[PDB]
Amino acid sequence: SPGIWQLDCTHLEGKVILVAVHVASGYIEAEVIPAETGQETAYFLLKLAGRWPVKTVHTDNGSNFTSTTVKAACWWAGIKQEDGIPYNPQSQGVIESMNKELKKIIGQVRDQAEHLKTAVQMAVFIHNHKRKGYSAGERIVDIIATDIQ
Amino acid sequence: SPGIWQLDCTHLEGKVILVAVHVASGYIEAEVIPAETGQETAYFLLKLAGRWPVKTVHTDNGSNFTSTTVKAACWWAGIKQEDGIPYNPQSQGVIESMNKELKKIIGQVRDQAEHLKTAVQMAVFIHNHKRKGYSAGERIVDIIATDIQ
Ligand SMILES: C=CC[N@H+](Cc1ccccc1C(=O)NCc1ccc(OC)cc1)Cc1ccc2c(c1C(=O)O)OC[C@H](CCC(=O)O)O2
Ligand SMILES: C=CC[N@H+](Cc1ccccc1C(=O)NCc1ccc(OC)cc1)Cc1ccc2c(c1C(=O)O)OC[C@H](CCC(=O)O)O2
Numbered sequence: 001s002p003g004i005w006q007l008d009c010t011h012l013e014g015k016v017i018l019v020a021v022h023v024a025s026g027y028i029e030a031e032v033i034p035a036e037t038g039q040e041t042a043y044f045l046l047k048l049a050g051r052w053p054v055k056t057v058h059t060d061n062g063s064n065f066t067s068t069t070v071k072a073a074c075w076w077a078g079i080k081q082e083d084g085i086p087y088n089p090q091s092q093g094v095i096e097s098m099n100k101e102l103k104k105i106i107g108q109v110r111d112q113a114e115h116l117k118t119a120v121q122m123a124v125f126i127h128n129h130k131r132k133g134y135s136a137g138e139r140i141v142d143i144i145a146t147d148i149q
Numbered sequence: 150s151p152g153i154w155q156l157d158c159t160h161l162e163g164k165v166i167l168v169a170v171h172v173a174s175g176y177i178e179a180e181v182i183p184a185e186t187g188q189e190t191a192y193f194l195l196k197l198a199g200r201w202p203v204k205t206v207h208t209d210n211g212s213n214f215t216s217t218t219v220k221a222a223c224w225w226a227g228i229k230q231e232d233g234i235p236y237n238p239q240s241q242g243v244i245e246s247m248n249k250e251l252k253k254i255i256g257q258v259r260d261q262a263e264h265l266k267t268a269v270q271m272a273v274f275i276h277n278h279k280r281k282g283y284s285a286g287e288r289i290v291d292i293i294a295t296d297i298q
Binding site: 029043046047049050051052053076077112117118121122124125128129137138141142144145146148149 | 178192195196198199200201202225226261266267270271273274277278286287290291293294295297298
């Protein structure tokens with residue numbers, strides 16, 4: 001549980017926003033990329049796993065699950081690559097809701113930056129700091145620290 | 150102390166590696182950029198503060214300290230922007246040693262990627278996971294979790 005992440009890809013402004021969600025906390029990292037290739041996804045996972053203790057990644061689609069570049073990044077970084085089949089149907093709903101929330105926040109900040117990437121990083125900040133009362137940033141640290149001890 | 154970070158800029162392959170170090174743990178994030186402009190630094194700090202609870206950043210030089218774009222990012226993200234004067238002389242040494250270690254690791258992985266950015270992210274991963282015994286990744290989470298609690 002402390003090490004499980006889920007990939008999510010959403011679209012805005014003719015660009016792709018790649019998101020990794022820490023399932024237990026709802027904490028996220030995200031980046032804007034031109035298109036969702038194996039190489040882009042692989043690089044994103046490499047960054048993520050250097051920053052947080054990523055044990056398992058549920059990939060966002062079959063192309064990323066299949067990609068030998070993504071498999072190679074998971075091998076490199078010691079990540080168990082898994083499918084993202086929503087065996088619990090609540091999973092699709094959670095992702096859909098998160099994409100809607102993120103796009104809402106991006107709208108709220110969109111005029112504060114020229115470039116979408118900037119707005120997306122503002123959105124990451126707002127999402128992770130939002131008290132729901134603990135924030136997702138607080139929850140991830142607490143969950144991982146409890147696991148370490 | 151749990152919220153204190155230090156910026157650090159080093160050079161390789163005619164490119165710039167921008168590093169943020171969490172002082173208390175030695176945990177790092179880093180990125181390759183073409184050159185160290187106010188905008189690049191501002192964007193990097195925005196990313197960092199969305200991911201970790203950044204209270205204070207000691208800037209790496211006077212240009213980044215002065216930069217109105219950097220001040221604007223720090224305002225946005227609620228970061229106290231400070232100078233990086235080594236009032237404790239041991240600070241220069243620590244930074245220099247870290248740059249040497251980072252460049253060492255990059256050399257050890259350099260043939261596993263075409264692009265320097267990939268090698269730098271591998272180096273971030275290796276540095277953060279290295280046990281010296283706890284890792285820097287373990288230390289940062291424990292320090293912050295203790296602070297929340
Ligand atoms: C077919 C992949 C290309 N190489 C092959 C390669 C070229 C030269 C030497 C070794 C290799 C090799 O296979 N090593 C094992 C390996 C595999 C996956 C992996 O995933 C992290 C890291 C390492 C690795 C690579 C991947 C993603 C990138 C890269 C690069 C790169 O070569 O630097 O560069 C930046 C790019 C940014 C995102 C974007 O622009 O899409 O993401
Ligand atoms: C002179 C700055 C340019 N704008 C001015 C702007 C343009 C339009 C509307 C508002 C503004 C505005 O001042 N808002 C307040 C503000 C200030 C600093 C800040 O820093 C996080 C974020 C927000 C903000 C900006 C900065 C760094 C970037 C950006 C962009 C951008 O406009 O999207 O785009 C990506 C780039 C990537 C790194 C690189 O390529 O150097 O970093």
